[PDB]
């Protein structure tokens, strides 16, 4: 049940009244994320979902708010029986786990799309018996907190949920789906997809979350979005306030996205006094070299995308090499097409888009244009060679020819006298390539005019022209 003191801000009657309430959370040895997540669906229903009535903020009544609580509690704590479930040495077990899990999904609508918006919290869970992916997995972790379970942890990578728990809290689990069509491997570890070095595992270097992280993640959940055109300003705000409030208590350090998601929301309404998006953006790096090995994608994806929004090629260049040069480190494995998709768009539309500009206003005569920097032009050569070497050793190939027209027009938008400058040097501005494609392309990149022909062939598998 909740606790006297947990109930003493109710009712809620604004975005500040929110706030209050999570730090009140955040000051007790176990934040109640069940309270917490109820809280953040009601006011994004009534902010996001049904805006009908709204004249200020969607006042949420501690009768409501209890009355919900006491819904998923009792659904949990009358399907879970601990005592079939002892608890050696004060942790759970692999079999409560997988009961838990299954007691989540056995909930679920039998036929929904998964892919909808506001369907995260424990609030749809209650209201509408619907959860997307990664909200079955806080689910599941905030049942087993509603359980007394203070080993079952949220895991998260880049593309995926899970738990962590048991002695050390070293075991793995799955308890949830991913994406569309893949098996299901619900109550297995991940062990054989960081075996595999898949991006999906991220080589083992995810995040275990602690209850604070835990808070951070339905934070970073909440969905301002109304519709296609439009976002609730208010949503926006409690999103960004309680980011900053989890930042200040030191519960973002672990959390490169949730540094990146606080850099967003901050060029979009920058709150005075604060750090700008670069700093954030930087910090967000930082978290990932620091505690994660540097094998995070999405660190440098959102770099990318602030300065690729501000129309900064040369940084945005750099730090889609950099992205680059995390991935060349993986194999690219079944169930990694998310990724696959970032850096095809990069390659195919976002740089093409970028570099057609930039010729144009090259022709309007601007300087100090990526377009004459040999430094531009060897970032571009790094992000090609970082997918290249991405690809080497995998299970699954990258390019093929329809990544190849792409690649020689990028290479064209520099005239031969700027790819010239960049020297490629071998081991055993200056640049080293790691994959062998690229090593087999260092012929064809200063020439005044690139051969099509034989970049075609060098980046694809492809050996023979057409016979006729």
């Not at 995390?326 to 195919?348: M, P, T």
Request: aromatic share 10%.
């Amino acid at each position: 049940g909740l606790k006297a003191a947990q109930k003493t801000l109710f009712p809620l009657r604004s975005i500040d009244d929110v706030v209050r309430l999570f730090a009140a959370e955040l000051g007790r040895e176990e934040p109640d994320l069940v309270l917490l997540s109820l809280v953040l669906g009601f006011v994004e229903h009534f902010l996001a979902v049904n805006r009908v009535g709204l004249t200020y903020f969607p006042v949420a009544d501690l009768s409501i708010i209890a009355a919900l609580y006491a819904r998923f509690t009792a659904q949990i704590r009358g399907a879970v029986d601990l005592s079939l479930y002892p608890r050696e040495g004060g942790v759970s077990s692999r079999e409560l786990v997988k009961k838990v899990s299954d007691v989540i999904w056995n909930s679920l609508s039998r036929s929904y799309f998964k892919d909808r918006a506001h369907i995260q919290s424990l609030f749809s869970f209650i209201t509408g018996t619907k959860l997307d992916s990664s909200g079955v997995a806080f689910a599941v972790v905030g049942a087993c907190q509603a359980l007394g379970l203070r080993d079952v942890h949220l895991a998260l990578s880049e593309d995926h949920a899970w738990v962590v728990f048991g002695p050390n809290g070293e075991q793995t689990a799955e308890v949830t789906w991913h994406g569309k069509g893949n098996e299901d491997r619900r109550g297995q570890t991940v062990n054989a997809g960081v075996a595999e070095r898949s991006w999906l595992y991220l080589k083992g270097s995810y995040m275990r979350c602690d209850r604070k992280m835990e808070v951070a993640f339905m934070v970073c959940a909440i969905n301002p979005s109304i519709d296609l055109h439009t976002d609730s300003l208010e949503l926006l705000q409690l999103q960004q306030k309680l980011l900053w409030l989890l930042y200040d208590l030191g519960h973002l350090e672990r959390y490169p996205m949730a540094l990146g998601n606080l850099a967003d929301l901050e060029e979009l309404e920058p709150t005075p006094g604060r750090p700008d998006p670069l700093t954030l953006y930087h910090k967000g790096i930082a978290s990932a070299k620091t505690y994660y090995r540097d094998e995070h994608i999405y660190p440098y994806m959102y770099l990318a995308g602030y300065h690729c929004r501000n129309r900064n090629v040369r940084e945005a260049l750099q730090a889609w090499a950099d992205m680059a040069t995390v991935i060349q480190d993986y194999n690219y494995c079944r169930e990694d097409e998310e990724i696959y998709k970032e850096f095809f768009e990069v390659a195919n539309d976002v740089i093409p888009n970028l570099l057609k500009e930039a010729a144009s206003l090259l022709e309007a005569g601007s300087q100090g244009s990526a377009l004459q920097d040999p430094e531009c032009f060897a970032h571009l050569l790094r992000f090609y060679d970082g997918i290249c070497k991405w690809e080497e050793g995998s299970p699954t190939p990258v390019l093929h020819v329809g990544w190849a027209t792409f690649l020689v027009q990028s290479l064209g938008r520099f005239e031969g006298q700027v790819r010239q400058k960049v020297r490629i040097v071998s081991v055993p501005p200056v640049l080293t390539f790691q994959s062998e494609k690229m090593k087999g392309m260092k012929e064809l990149l200063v020439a005044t005019k690139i051969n099509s022909s034989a970049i075609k062939l060098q980046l694809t598998a492809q050996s023979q022209v057409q016979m006729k």
